[PDB]
């Protein structure tokens, strides 16, 4: 088991600003496997869902590799292993509106949490 301590919440920011989407987690004793973190986006302005935007796996970050939000979504912490899977989305666009899901796995534990993002003109 594994818990994401951030609550599901709605972040509202203005176009062109930076959105911080928190995702902080704690581990249970059996979570001894490799830390794996992913974020997915389900945008409001298209019917595509669960698209990967960022991944931490094998102690490497893959961010711009994923086309959605390329160049604009990055992990905020310099130590993800300390329990901080949060991300920043820079230069917010109206197309960024949607539901973002943080997925944290440290085998065998798994947890997920959704953050809703609204961008204001």
Could you please report the per-residue DSSP string of 11-78?
A: EEEETTS-EEE--BEEE-TT--S-EEEEEEEEETTSS--SEEEEEEETTEEE-TTSSTTTTTEEE--S
**Burial group, residue 114, by CB count within 10 angstroms (0-12, 13-18, 19+):** middle
Write out the CATH class of domain 1-121. Answer: mainly beta
Resolution to 1 decimal place, in Å: 9.0
Structure tokens, 84: 């901080």
In the chain, where are the structural domains located? Answer: 1-121
What is the distance between the alpha carbons of residues 9 and 58, in angstroms, rounded to a whole number?
29
My answer on whether omega of the bond before 108 falls inside 30° of 0, hence cis, is yes
Rg (CA), the chain: 14
- DSSP-derived letter for residue 84 is B
Technique used to solve these coordinates:
cryo-EM
């Amino acid at each position: 088991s594994l818990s994401i301590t951030t609550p599901e919440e709605m972040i509202e920011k203005a176009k062109g600003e930076t959105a911080y989407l928190p995702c902080k987690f704690t581990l249970s004793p059996e979570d001894q496997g490799p830390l794996d973190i992913e974020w997915l986006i389900s945008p409001a302005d298209n019917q595509k869902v669960d698209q990967v935007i960022i991944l931490y796996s094998g102690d490497k970050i893959y961010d711009d590799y994923y086309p959605d939000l390329k160049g604009r979504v990055h992990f905020t912490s310099n130590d993800l292993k300390s329990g901080d899977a949060s991300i920043n989305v820079t230069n917010l666009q109206l197309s960024d509106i949607g539901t973002y899901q943080c997925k944290v796995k440290k085998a065998p534990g798994v947890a997920n949490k959704k953050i809703h993002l609204v961008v204001l003109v």
